[PDB]
Design a protein around this ligand. Structure first.
Ligand SMILES: *[C@@H]1O[C@H](CO)[C@@H](O[C@@H]2O[C@H](CO)[C@@H](O[C@H]3O[C@H](CO)[C@@H](O)[C@H](O)[C@@H]3O)[C@H](O)[C@H]2NC(C)=O)[C@H](O)[C@H]1NC(C)=O
Ligand SMILES: *[C@@H]1O[C@H](CO)[C@@H](O[C@@H]2O[C@H](CO)[C@@H](O[C@H]3O[C@H](CO)[C@@H](O)[C@H](O)[C@@H]3O)[C@H](O)[C@H]2NC(C)=O)[C@H](O)[C@H]1NC(C)=O
Ligand SMILES: *[C@@H]1O[C@H](CO)[C@@H](O[C@@H]2O[C@H](CO)[C@@H](O[C@H]3O[C@H](CO)[C@@H](O)[C@H](O)[C@@H]3O)[C@H](O)[C@H]2NC(C)=O)[C@H](O)[C@H]1NC(C)=O
Ligand SMILES: *[C@@H]1O[C@H](CO[C@@H]2O[C@@H](C)[C@@H](O)[C@@H](O)[C@@H]2O)[C@@H](O[C@@H]2O[C@H](CO)[C@@H](O)[C@H](O)[C@H]2NC(C)=O)[C@H](O)[C@H]1NC(C)=O
Ligand SMILES: *[C@@H]1O[C@H](CO)[C@@H](O[C@@H]2O[C@H](CO)[C@@H](O)[C@H](O)[C@H]2NC(C)=O)[C@H](O)[C@H]1NC(C)=O
Ligand SMILES: *[C@@H]1O[C@H](CO)[C@@H](O[C@@H]2O[C@H](CO)[C@@H](O)[C@H](O)[C@H]2NC(C)=O)[C@H](O)[C@H]1NC(C)=O
Ligand SMILES: *[C@@H]1O[C@H](CO)[C@@H](O[C@@H]2O[C@H](CO)[C@@H](O)[C@H](O)[C@H]2NC(C)=O)[C@H](O)[C@H]1NC(C)=O
Ligand SMILES: *[C@@H]1O[C@H](CO)[C@@H](O)[C@H](O)[C@H]1NC(C)=O
Ligand SMILES: *[C@@H]1O[C@H](CO)[C@@H](O)[C@H](O)[C@H]1NC(C)=O
Ligand SMILES: *[C@@H]1O[C@H](CO)[C@@H](O)[C@H](O)[C@H]1NC(C)=O
Ligand SMILES: *[C@@H]1O[C@H](CO)[C@@H](O)[C@H](O)[C@H]1NC(C)=O
Lengths: 317, 40, 240, 46
């Protein structure tokens, strides 16, 4: 849904602790401002992407203190109060399975506008709206309905007659509870399940690591250190060596901002898809084949993850 | 008497839905809502 | 329904005739297009390490061979200023194409149809949409049904009658607290629970939370008045 | 006749088959024709 926000002091990356290099960097004009406008346009939309996916709920819906859901046991996916952040049991698996020297090069990482607690509160309201009121909170005010009577409406939505729920309701509840059991066990045991979210964190880290490594490169200058060039050469020869480092560093920044702009378009397409799965699979029931998992869609439960969303899609097979 | 303030943002009005194993809410009326969407 | 539609289109005129900022998504595109050309004209004023930013100040002052060392600086910096503009525009054009492919899909599914996709054609249950054009964009007026004034009712998954369990054909069972009705799911309009509103399956023992109420059979009183019609015909025939 | 609808005749549908179709109104009237008949047979007595 999002990637890390970054910004750079283009003058500190290229020319950190050098008045001479800073006075030569003025020969290139707008480029250092234009790089910062690009990284800001990316950073502003990471908050947009997150808010378009999670903030689809008008009110912070709460579950009742009595959990009479007709045998369906949501306790693995609902908020757990005995925590500093009220995440669910499955959300605290997801937050552990993704694992997350640059600063003094003028590079910095900006916080997201919504904290992980606020993403968990929106997810709690989407889940507590869904299990107390069905799709009705997506299309008006939340109107309560009993959960087994909602699941009968969902059975009619897949073309199955509603007595096939009420006459089999204990089997359907046990199969749901056993299937949510297997979600925990899979996520706990298996490393590669969150590979999509770890790959975004790994691409951000490899990009900043490569950006900092390009400071050690000569670009054909006599040293990669501005103080060596400025101590060993006079004004008119040092200004020829410093310009090689300015030219190569400024291309090292322009390459980072281009791969970040290109990668931000992939994350936006994924956030727009995740916002559509939130609207159509969580706030509704979907007739779109294979869109909300394999089978005939009954319903979906959102869970938050580090820089992403997890949908637990429930289907009749 | 004006100033800049700083605050933790609210996520929306809070709501306990009146769920029970035998209660349903049914709308006795409707509104027609026209809403504008702008796309490049 | 017509007066609510006419009042809702009235509020679109009032909003667009009032606020300065409603088309901010389209003004952002114009502002980005204009800012990129104004930035590209500003990069002409830069020296890139040449003695001047102006070729006429190099070609009037330097000879044919000392000029080329200055001219190549200006060529190198400008050529990078165009490759930056065109890379920004190729990336930015893919943002606008993704939005044009969405707007073409809202034209097909919201205007040329009625969408069942939730929140695709406005916030509600979609009725229809009307397209309006704008500078470099499209505006969809999405018309939606929003349910407005709910009442709480008691409810049941089934009704139990002759030991048989009855379920709604379309609708849901509700009670006002003393009588049982069947009603459509999205608007309170109650009916007596008849054999034309319900279907049978199995016996009352298998459904969790089933309730006892009578289920009316509309054929029965039309046969029972046929039983009074028969009985008075026999009473008349006793006379001779 | 409650699960099914009718249109046309057996001559047009490729692969149509023969089976009885129950009319739930038929025994509901035939058990009423025995309610006619037993009331008539009683009224033979006076
Ligand atoms: C639950 O719904 C019931 C149906 O609306 C309602 O019962 C109905 O009550 C009205 C009076 O308020 C009765 O109306 C009739 O009253 C006399 C009967 O002799 C006539 O002179 C009138 O013309 C009129 O027809 C209905 O007969 C009665 N219907 C039934 C099926 O009993 C309940 O009062 C409602 N309960 C609650 C708590 O809302
Ligand atoms: C819904 O309607 C059902 C049918 O009338 C009713 O079931 C009947 O309930 C009564 C009272 O509990 C039972 O009465 C008999 O119970 C046992 C034998 O089963 C005897 O020991 C008692 O002395 C008494 O005679 C009926 O036998 C029982 N009938 C059936 C077919 O189950 C439900 O209780 C009703 N439910 C509600 C909540 O009203
Ligand atoms: C489905 O049921 C139909 C009704 O019983 C049946 O139609 C009947 O078919 C037989 C055999 O074709 C006909 O028998 C007559 O055939 C000729 C006249 O067409 C005579 O020379 C014979 O002696 C004999 O009487 C029936 O007349 C015909 N009835 C009707 C009303 O058309 C279908 O054949 C059955 N189809 C299948 C696949 O079982
Ligand atoms: C639907 O009912 C709920 C609560 O249950 C009701 O409680 C009684 C007041 C009575 O109506 C019973 O028949 C029901 O069992 C209502 O929720 C309450 O709303 C008030 C404000 O009106 C609020 O002060 C309470 O805290 C709420 N209590 C709970 C438990 O939610 C709700 O307003 C009713 N909705 C409609 C549309 O009538
Ligand atoms: C819902 O499922 C959870 C298991 O995922 C049940 O919680 C366990 O209940 C047993 C019996 O009391 C305890 O020994 C465990 O320690 C519980 N585990 C956790 C993670 O809390 C829960 O009881 C089920 N709910 C209902 C109503 O049956
Ligand atoms: C329908 O399939 C379910 C399983 O998907 C069957 O339920 C299992 O039944 C066996 C005994 O037949 C038990 O050992 C299992 O514990 C049951 N599983 C669950 C989750 O309850 C069910 O019997 C099948 N029904 C029919 C009519 O075939
Ligand atoms: C359904 O809601 C509409 C408004 O959304 C109600 O219509 C209004 O009714 C009041 C009197 O009760 C009038 O003063 C208004 O002028 C009406 N507005 C319109 C647009 O006509 C309507 O009465 C409600 N119906 C029910 C059955 O509750
Ligand atoms: C609903 O819950 C109540 C307790 O609040 C219980 O007495 C009742 O039997 C339950 N009914 C159903 C249909 O589960
Ligand atoms: C008896 O029924 C006959 C019709 O069979 C009718 O003509 C006659 O008026 C009736 N008379 C009485 C007294 O009911
Ligand atoms: C089906 O195929 C068989 C041959 O396997 C053929 O005899 C029969 O007439 C066919 N029936 C229909 C309804 O096409
Ligand atoms: C026959 O009809 C008389 C009334 O005329 C009634 O009293 C009697 O019970 C009936 N008997 C039978 C066997 O239906």
């Amino acid at each position: 849904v999002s990637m890390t926000k970054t910004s750079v002091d283009c003058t500190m990356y290229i020319c950190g602790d050098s008045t001479e290099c800073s006075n030569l960097l003025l020969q290139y004009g707008s480029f250092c401002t234009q790089l910062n406008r690009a990284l800001t346009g990316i950073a502003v939309e990471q908050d947009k992407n997150t808010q378009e996916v999670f903030a689809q709920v008008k009110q912070i819906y709460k579950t009742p203190p009595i959990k009479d859901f007709g045998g369906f046991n949501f306790s693995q996916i609902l908020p757990d109060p005995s925590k500093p952040s009220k995440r669910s049991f499955i959300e605290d698996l997801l937050f552990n399975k993704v694992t997350l020297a640059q600063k003094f090069n003028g590079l910095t990482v900006l916080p997201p506008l919504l904290t992980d607690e606020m993403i968990a509160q929106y997810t709690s309201a989407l889940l507590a709206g869904t299990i107390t009121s069905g799709w009705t909170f997506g299309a008006g005010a939340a109107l309560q309905i009993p959960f087994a009577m909602q699941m009968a409406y969902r059975f009619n939505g897949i073309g199955v007659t509603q007595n096939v729920l009420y006459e089999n309701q204990k089997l359907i509840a046990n199969q749901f509870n056993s299937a949510i059991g297997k979600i925990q066990d899979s996520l706990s045991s298996t490393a590669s399940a969150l590979g999509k979210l770890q790959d975004v964190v790994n691409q951000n880290a490899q990009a900043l690591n490569t950006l900092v490594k390009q400071l050690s490169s000569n670009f054909g200058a006599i040293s990669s250190v501005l103080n060596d060039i400025l101590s060993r050469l006079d004004k008119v020869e040092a200004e020829v060596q410093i310009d090689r480092l300015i030219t190569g560093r400024l291309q090292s920044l322009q390459t980072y901002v281009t791969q970040q702009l290109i990668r931000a378009a992939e994350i936006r397409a994924s956030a727009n898809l995740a916002a559509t799965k939130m609207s159509e699979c969580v706030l509704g029931q979907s007739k779109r084949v294979d869109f909300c998992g394999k089978g005939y869609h009954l319903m979906s439960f959102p869970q938050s993850a580090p820089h992403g969303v997890v949908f637990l899609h429930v289907t009749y097979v | 008497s004006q100033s800049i303030i700083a605050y933790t943002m609210s996520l929306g009005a809070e709501n306990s839905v009146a769920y029970s194993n035998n209660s349903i809410a049914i709308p006795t009326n409707f509104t027609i809502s026209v809403t504008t969407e702008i796309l490049p | 329904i017509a007066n609510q539609f006419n009042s809702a289109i009235g509020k679109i005129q009032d909003s667009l005739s009032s606020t300065a900022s409603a088309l901010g998504k389209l003004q952002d595109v114009v502002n980005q297009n204009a800012q990129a050309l104004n930035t590209l004209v500003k990069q002409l004023s830069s020296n890139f390490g040449a003695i001047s930013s102006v070729l006429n100040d190099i070609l009037s002052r330097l000879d044919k061979v000392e000029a080329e060392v200055q001219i190549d600086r200006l060529i190198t910096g400008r050529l990078q200023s165009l490759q930056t503009y065109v890379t920004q525009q190729l990336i930015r054009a893919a943002e606008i194409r993704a939005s044009a492919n969405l707007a073409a899909t809202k034209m097909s599914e919201c205007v040329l149809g009625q969408s069942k996709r939730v929140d695709f054609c406005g916030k509600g249950y979609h009725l229809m949409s009307f397209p309006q054009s704008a500078p470099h964009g499209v505006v969809f007026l999405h018309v939606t049904y929003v349910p407005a004034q709910e009442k709480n009712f008691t409810t049941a998954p089934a009704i139990c009658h002759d030991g048989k369990a009855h379920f709604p054909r379309e609708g849901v069972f509700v009670s006002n607290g003393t009588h049982w009705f069947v009603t459509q799911r999205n608007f309170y309009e109650p009916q007596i629970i008849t054999t034309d509103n319900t279907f049978v399956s199995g016996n009352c023992d298998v459904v969790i939370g089933i309730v006892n109420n009578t289920v009316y059979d509309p054929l029965q009183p039309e046969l029972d008045s046929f039983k009074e019609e028969l009985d008075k015909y026999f009473k008349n025939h006793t006379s001779p």
